[PDB]
Write a protein that binds this ligand. Structure first.
Ligand SMILES: *[C@@H]1O[C@H](CO)[C@@H](O[C@@H]2O[C@H](CO)[C@@H](O)[C@H](O)[C@H]2NC(C)=O)[C@H](O)[C@H]1NC(C)=O
Ligand SMILES: *[C@@H]1O[C@H](CO)[C@@H](O[C@@H]2O[C@H](CO)[C@@H](O)[C@H](O)[C@H]2NC(C)=O)[C@H](O)[C@H]1NC(C)=O
Ligand SMILES: *[C@@H]1O[C@H](CO)[C@@H](O[C@@H]2O[C@H](CO)[C@@H](O)[C@H](O)[C@H]2NC(C)=O)[C@H](O)[C@H]1NC(C)=O
Ligand SMILES: *[C@@H]1O[C@H](CO)[C@@H](O[C@@H]2O[C@H](CO)[C@@H](O)[C@H](O)[C@H]2NC(C)=O)[C@H](O)[C@H]1NC(C)=O
Ligand SMILES: *[C@@H]1O[C@H](CO)[C@@H](O[C@@H]2O[C@H](CO)[C@@H](O)[C@H](O)[C@H]2NC(C)=O)[C@H](O)[C@H]1NC(C)=O
Ligand SMILES: *[C@@H]1O[C@H](CO)[C@@H](O[C@@H]2O[C@H](CO)[C@@H](O)[C@H](O)[C@H]2NC(C)=O)[C@H](O)[C@H]1NC(C)=O
Ligand SMILES: *[C@@H]1O[C@H](CO)[C@@H](O)[C@H](O)[C@H]1NC(C)=O
Ligand SMILES: *[C@@H]1O[C@H](CO)[C@@H](O)[C@H](O)[C@H]1NC(C)=O
Ligand SMILES: *[C@@H]1O[C@H](CO)[C@@H](O)[C@H](O)[C@H]1NC(C)=O
Ligand SMILES: *[C@@H]1O[C@H](CO)[C@@H](O)[C@H](O)[C@H]1NC(C)=O
Ligand SMILES: *[C@@H]1O[C@H](CO)[C@@H](O)[C@H](O)[C@H]1NC(C)=O
Ligand SMILES: *[C@@H]1O[C@H](CO)[C@@H](O)[C@H](O)[C@H]1NC(C)=O
Ligand SMILES: *[C@@H]1O[C@H](CO)[C@@H](O)[C@H](O)[C@H]1NC(C)=O
Ligand SMILES: *[C@@H]1O[C@H](CO)[C@@H](O)[C@H](O)[C@H]1NC(C)=O
Ligand SMILES: *[C@@H]1O[C@H](CO)[C@@H](O)[C@H](O)[C@H]1NC(C)=O
Ligand SMILES: *[C@@H]1O[C@H](CO)[C@@H](O)[C@H](O)[C@H]1NC(C)=O
Ligand SMILES: *[C@@H]1O[C@H](CO)[C@@H](O)[C@H](O)[C@H]1NC(C)=O
Ligand SMILES: *[C@@H]1O[C@H](CO)[C@@H](O)[C@H](O)[C@H]1NC(C)=O
Ligand SMILES: *[C@@H]1O[C@H](CO)[C@@H](O)[C@H](O)[C@H]1NC(C)=O
Ligand SMILES: *[C@@H]1O[C@H](CO)[C@@H](O)[C@H](O)[C@H]1NC(C)=O
Ligand SMILES: *[C@@H]1O[C@H](CO)[C@@H](O)[C@H](O)[C@H]1NC(C)=O
Ligand SMILES: *[C@@H]1O[C@H](CO)[C@@H](O)[C@H](O)[C@H]1NC(C)=O
Lengths: 136, 595, 595, 136
């Protein structure tokens, strides 16, 4: 319900989590095509942690078959590559990150991903998102 | 207390409840209060009077819009005060008055306008100051800084600074003793008035994300002549506008600045020629963190680099180096799988190649690193080392570390045979079926072994610890041992910690350990013991800790002597409380037979 | 029989007993006799009369010095006759008379002198002939060869041949149909008379170890103009005198010889330029075996190589190739640790990189090998593969083999997702904790899985075999399973062999296997079973073999029904004989309760 | 007793095995120095097998501490590098092989090596030698 885009071959949607509702606005340009894409992802929110040791826990599910759990490090403290690694709790963050991906084949079906952002220094959850992708 | 206590009478986390004033029922003697996102709108006199023990206060995103005169009256030990987010546009005089030990003021995003109308003149203890994201327009340092004697960092990042002029940093000319650390990242600097820096000395200067024009950056950098900096940090950010063409000619101007340690962070377009620019020869400590370099082919031989660090930088091939002055090379967390190449570094004394997929096929030869003075080698978390020599020339090493690598061919001969003065070996989690009792020969000075995920032949601890007298810390955990051969440990007269958890021992013996005069900890839990054969009075009395948890001791009158000793000499055992038995009946602690 | 029998009435090994005549008591109907090193000194008429069934006779190092006329009289089915070592200087006529089916005569080191005074004219079945180390002086083939129609190999190695002349190989000019295979290694050839080879066609020609002068070799090789050979083998030996300088100009002369497959073996000094010589462009199948090459940098693009093999050759870097005609590249048992590099081989259809330490970091991308027609990939015994793609372009593969490599990141997504037509997968002994039930998704045509040293999560066989209907051979041995989840195997309607030995099963169930209509072998031994729960009549009757050995079945009336079924339907079980029980009393086979 | 040489820092000797006495003459030039050497090894004998798949089983012992067992392949059938890989049982072999070694440190003491040559195709032992090296 929060946000959804229809690409050429994908339908992407997200909604808030259930045990955490901390606002965050996020979108992309253009709507991703699981057949390889290259574009930008826009973010806007107000942290509730220091964003200095920020990483993600991803719980993914393909056609109801849980993969293992993924952990993606985004900032690590020492001369990070992104400008927002230096925001503080209460400080408006508003940015656009570039990305590209290509070369993998994805099984058709229905995917789900629960992506929760953790402040690594204190182990608190900054937010939790409930994603839903349908590849056709 | 309308808020959640973390610790009894301390650390009262009160974040994000609908409040409009600091609670009155919060006990004094508290030390850390957090009122964030509460909808306060004005601070009032004496409101914090009783908290004459508080030393960490946070008021972020509260909608503070004004402040009463004697707001922070009774605060006497407050060290850290945060104020991010509050739209306090004008700080009228007399604010920050009561505070008398503040050490770290954070005023980010408080719609500030200038650093002169900032009544902090008397805060004579302030270490740090952070006013990023604050509408400021001029780098001009105000005069009252002369009073803030112990100030060692100022952060002006993400402001509206546009130009630098000679009368700014005037304070720094007249005061050649202030040990200040500046920062101006993300300021659209376009005109550094000539002669701006002259006779100025900073301890650090960040300039990441300033310019987006090649010539603008060229000339601005050029105007820094005269500076004398201890750490100059350059680079860009991924999520911002940035240069599309970077050429070593931009480095011009830096050719007359006394840099002392030059760090170069991420850069969108990077040509390996940048680092080979004729006016880096005097830099003392190069560094690269995130730059997508490919080949570090060949640097001149008059460069005076005394250090070199490459962290998280992509690489496709081990660099080739001949610097006769470099020492302490470091290449870590590389983003590729490279194989080691022979180098010639006559002055190297510290090497670190961890966290890469460094497959190092030949091994331990002076021919691979022309240094007779190495002291710290580290190849942890690498791909696959292949031993083919016993450190014929590296006879000074004092610190070796092969963790998580696949260490191949080490059981086929006395490796480590020449490391006669080594202090810290570590071979944990290298799949190493110890099946040769000469594997640790020559390590006459070792003090710390660490093997955890390593097997043995027959699951029997062989006699591999002779001629290792000085061992003081020994970790055998997580091996899948099933019995301890007789005679081991019989000469470790100084071992003080002997970890053996998570093994599959069937029982315990006391004839062992009988010569461990100095032992003091004998963690032997999680290894499914039943009893302690042998006379139970030969243990060393110096044992202070003995884990016996997650065991399976059978208290079915099995060794009544042991079942009595276990509940008698328990002022040493760990968690004697929940010592369950495993033979019906369970849930017990004492056996009926005494003495 | 003064000698040791190997097989009853066959294969009477009688080597090295002090004999002076073939034993008389050796039974007829024997087939293989070996009289080696016995001190015979003369063969006598009819001595082998009764052995009219012998077909393999060996007389090596016997001190045979003469032969009687009707020596080999009664031998009618003798195929292989060896005579190495015996100093039979002169073979007077009429020897080899009685032999009428000899197929392989070996006369090495019999102080021969010439190939004309060799009375073999009538042996019209002789396939091979070996007269190496035999004093011969002239390559002249004798005329009577016209009679030995089915002769396809002659070995003149290690003789005294000195020169070749036009009237030798005359036979081969007049007879353009003889399919002969010559060999002249280790002959001090120094003068090949001009026009020697002209209109001559051999099927193979070895010349390893002939020359030790650069110019001599140059001119001699030059004189081969006109030849038409199917496999030319050159090179040297390590333990002999050999060229110290090898330059591509020696290859001159070969520039007008119709080579069809050029093999180049060990060479003392080797320059990578040798292979890039302008007159190899017409060779059809290059090959290198032992040459210490370093860089195969860049070969012209008009070369017509259709194959390329590099075996046991040292290498320091993956070669770079662009041959638009090469197919079936092979690089094996290399003597270094190299990492894969991207190549462009539009016609490749067979790749083999086994037994190296090929660490192949990126993976399964058409961008790595520009071939849309691969059919046989093989990366066994390599170092560490790292999956990063699902064969996006290699959709023709039919044979994949990742054995003993460290296969990393394969459980994190559906690898193999694009190999919709694959027949033989093999991932044994790649440490692979199967913890994802989509790991084998897409393999709709697989027929042969092979995973042996691979674990599972919880030691429980998950449901990972859906959408693998066509599986016909499945090997799960040597996993450390401890139970089989319910529902597995429920659609393998064609599995015919199901290996599960060496597991740690506690018992057996029959509700499983109930849908394996075609099963015929169910090796389930060495896995410590106690009984067979579930009704024991749902097994498929098509089971012909059932190992139940090294088990621990308890015959303490535990499941009397099973203890009866095991000794009743035993015409299928394997070695029902030694079926011990493991609950006192042991050493038994039958239980008292019948029916 | 069979043959022995005294080098600068080594004493090398060999003798026949106990359950096999098949003659073979073997020597080296110059007497090896365990401190790295470069020279030739001369061989002369009369095989009792085909020498086409010839390898060695080495059982080594350092100061009475058995190492694992080594297997060294010398010929393998396909275009081998040595001229004697092509000899046959009964055919005199007489050759000299070049070798070099350097770069390893060897514990002083007493070594022993039982080196048995196996014809790989039929698994028969061509000979067995009992070596003895004393490094000083
Ligand atoms: C000057 O103040 C700076 C604080 O910024 C101090 O610099 C630190 O020095 C330590 C060791 O001396 C380094 O590990 C840090 O990297 C430095 N911090 C930064 C951010 O630069 C410095 O110690 C002070 N100098 C004096 C004379 O007190
Ligand atoms: C011995 O090493 C073991 C590793 O097996 C340590 O065990 C850990 O104990 C800590 C608490 O002491 C736990 O938090 C960990 O979960 C344990 N590790 C495992 C793998 O379970 C043990 O601490 C070490 N003993 C000593 C004396 O330091
Ligand atoms: C067993 O008890 C011992 C002693 O209490 C534990 O040892 C402590 O472990 C922590 C974490 O490893 C160390 O930081 C301390 O230094 C250890 N203390 C001493 C002096 O030994 C041990 O971890 C416990 N083991 C398990 C597996 O529970
Ligand atoms: C000519 O005789 C030779 C025997 O030397 C045969 O050559 C073999 O051919 C097979 C397949 O055709 C190859 O696998 C072998 O490598 C060849 N042997 C050698 C040693 O060259 C050949 O088959 C015969 N040709 C005809 C027409 O019968
Ligand atoms: C199943 O694979 C196992 C491997 O564990 C095979 O077991 C071998 O059996 C042969 C004789 O059949 C023995 O010589 C080997 O020693 C066994 N291997 C091990 C590791 O012990 C077994 O043959 C295979 N079963 C089938 C049906 O082929
Ligand atoms: C169990 O018995 C079976 C059947 O007799 C053995 O299977 C044979 O094993 C050999 C060697 O692996 C194969 O060459 C045969 O093809 C197998 N026969 C069939 C048709 O299965 C099996 O090896 C034995 N297993 C053990 C471990 O003893
Ligand atoms: C995500 O949403 C689904 C329904 O769309 C829900 O079942 C699931 O529990 C949600 N995930 C979490 C972590 O709450
Ligand atoms: C966030 O930044 C973008 C430009 O990067 C700007 O267009 C947008 O207006 C900003 N957000 C708000 C709320 O203004
Ligand atoms: C904190 O306050 C409570 C109640 O006033 C009191 O009982 C307690 O002793 C105080 N100190 C601590 C450490 O809890
Ligand atoms: C301090 O405590 C006293 C008594 O506990 C109370 O009367 C007073 O109001 C408190 N101070 C403030 C500022 O609330
Ligand atoms: C320091 O503070 C005092 C306050 O008494 C003030 O008089 C003085 O001018 C300040 N220093 C400077 C340099 O202004
Ligand atoms: C740098 O950024 C500013 C802000 O958008 C822009 O006006 C200017 O044109 C940029 N510089 C160049 C050289 O494009
Ligand atoms: C600084 O480097 C320059 C070359 O860029 C060199 O000429 C000069 O001597 C150096 N200054 C020193 C070594 O003090
Ligand atoms: C090494 O140990 C052996 C016995 O294992 C002993 O003879 C020798 O003296 C030791 N070397 C020393 C103590 O340097
Ligand atoms: C071989 O000879 C023996 C004795 O003459 C005879 O008993 C036997 O049947 C013969 N055949 C075989 C196959 O042993
Ligand atoms: C063949 O066998 C017969 C009877 O067994 C024997 O008399 C005769 O001597 C044998 N032939 C030879 C050549 O010994
Ligand atoms: C083949 O053998 C016969 C024996 O009858 C002989 O006459 C003939 O000359 C032989 N062939 C040649 C080419 O000599
Ligand atoms: C080749 O070997 C022979 C035999 O020893 C020798 O006489 C000749 O000089 C060698 N050729 C060269 C070019 O040395
Ligand atoms: C053989 O190769 C030569 C170049 O070495 C070439 O000129 C000639 O055309 C080739 N012969 C063919 C292709 O038949
Ligand atoms: C793959 O398996 C799923 C269920 O596990 C099934 O729905 C799907 O149809 C299968 N794909 C085929 C048979 O191609
Ligand atoms: C080698 O000789 C020693 C005595 O020098 C002997 O004890 C040993 O058994 C011999 N080795 C073999 C394999 O016979
Ligand atoms: C063996 O060959 C060498 C030359 O390689 C020779 O000196 C020696 O005499 C030969 N052996 C005999 C027994 O002649």
């Amino acid at each position: 319900q929060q946000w959804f885009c229809n690409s050429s071959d994908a339908i992407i949607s997200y909604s808030y989590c259930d045990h955490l509702k901390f606002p965050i606005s996020i979108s992309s340009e253009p709507c991703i095509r699981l057949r390889g894409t290259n574009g930008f992802v826009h973010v806007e929110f107000i942290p509730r942690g220091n964003l200095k040791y920020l990483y993600f826990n991803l719980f993914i599910s393909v056609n109801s078959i849980e993969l293992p759990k993924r952990k993606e490090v985004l900032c690590h403290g020492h001369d990070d590559d992104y400008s927002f690694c230096r925001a503080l709790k209460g400080e408006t963050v508003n940015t656009s990150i570039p990305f590209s991906f290509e070369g993998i084949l994805f099984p058709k079906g229905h995917y789900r991903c629960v992506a929760e952002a953790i402040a690594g220094d204190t182990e608190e959850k900054l937010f939790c998102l409930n994603f839903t992708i349908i590849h056709r | 207390n309308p808020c959640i206590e973390v610790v009894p009478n301390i650390t009262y986390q009160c974040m994000d409840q609908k409040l409009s004033k600091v609670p009155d029922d919060i006990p004094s003697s508290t030390k850390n209060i957090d009122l964030s996102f509460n909808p306060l709108k004005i601070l009032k006199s004496y409101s914090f009077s009783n908290f004459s023990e508080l030393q960490w206060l946070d008021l972020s995103r509260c909608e503070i819009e004004t402040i009463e005169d004697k707001a922070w009256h009774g605060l006497h030990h407050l060290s850290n005060l945060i104020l991010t987010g509050n739209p306090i546009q004008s700080f009228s005089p007399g604010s920050f008055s009561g505070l008398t030990s503040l050490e770290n003021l954070v005023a980010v995003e408080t719609k500030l306008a200038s650093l002169e109308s900032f009544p902090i003149g008397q805060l004579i203890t302030l270490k740090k100051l952070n006013v990023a994201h604050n509408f400021i327009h001029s780098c001009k340092l105000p005069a009252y800084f002369s009073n803030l004697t112990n100030l060692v960092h100022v952060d002006l990042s993400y402001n509206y600074i546009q130009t630098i002029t000679v009368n700014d940093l005037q304070f720094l000319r007249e005061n050649p003793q202030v040990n200040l650390s500046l920062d101006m990242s993300l300021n659209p600097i376009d005109f550094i008035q000539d002669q701006a820096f002259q006779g100025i000395k900073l301890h650090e200067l960040t300039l990441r994300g300033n310019f987006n024009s090649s010539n603008i950056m060229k000339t601005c950098l050029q105007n820094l002549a005269g500076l004398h900096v201890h750490r100059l940090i350059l680079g860009e950010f991924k999520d911002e506008r940035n240069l599309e063409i970077f050429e070593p000619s931009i480095m011009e101007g830096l050719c007359d600045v006394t840099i002392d340690e030059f760090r170069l962070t991420y850069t969108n377009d990077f040509s390996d020629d940048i680092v080979k620019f004729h006016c880096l020869a005097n830099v003392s400590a190069m560094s690269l963190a995130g730059v997508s370099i490919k080949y570090l082919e060949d640097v001149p031989k008059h460069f005076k680099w005394q250090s070199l660090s490459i962290i998280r930088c992509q690489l496709k091939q081990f660099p080739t180096l001949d610097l006769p002055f470099l020492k302490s090379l470091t290449l870590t967390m590389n983003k590729g799988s490279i194989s080691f190449k022979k180098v010639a570094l006559p002055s190297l004394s510290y090497l670190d190649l961890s966290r890469n997929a460094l497959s190092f096929s030949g091994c331990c030869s002076y021919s691979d690193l022309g240094t007779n003075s190495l002291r710290h080698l580290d190849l942890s978390f690498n791909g696959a080392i292949i031993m083919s020599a016993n450190f014929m020339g590296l006879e000074e090493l004092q610190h070796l570390d092969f963790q998580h690598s696949t260490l191949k061919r080490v059981t086929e001969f006395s490796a480590f045979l020449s490391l006669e003065k080594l202090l810290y070996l570590d071979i944990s989690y290298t799949n190493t079926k110890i099946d040769f009792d000469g594997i640790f020969l020559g390590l006459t000075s070792l003090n710390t072994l660490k093997m955890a995920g390593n097997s043995f032949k027959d699951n029997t601890l062989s006699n591999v610890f002779a001629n290792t007298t000085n061992l003081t810390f020994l970790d055998l955990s997580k091996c899948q041992l099933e019995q301890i051969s007789w005679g081991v440990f019989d000469t470790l007269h100084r071992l003080q910690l002997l970890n053996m958890s998570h093994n599959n021992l069937l029982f315990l013996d006391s004839s062992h350990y009988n010569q461990l005069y100095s032992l003091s900890t004998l963690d032997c839990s999680f290894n499914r013991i039943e009893t302690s054969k042998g006379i139970l009075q030969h243990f060393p009395k110096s044992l202070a800790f003995f884990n016996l948890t997650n065991n399976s001791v059978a208290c079915i009158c099995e060794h009544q002597k042991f079942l009595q000793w276990v509940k008698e000499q328990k002022q040493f055992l760990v968690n004697v409380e929940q010592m369950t038995c495993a033979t019906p009946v369970e849930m017990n602690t004492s056996l009926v037979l005494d003495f």
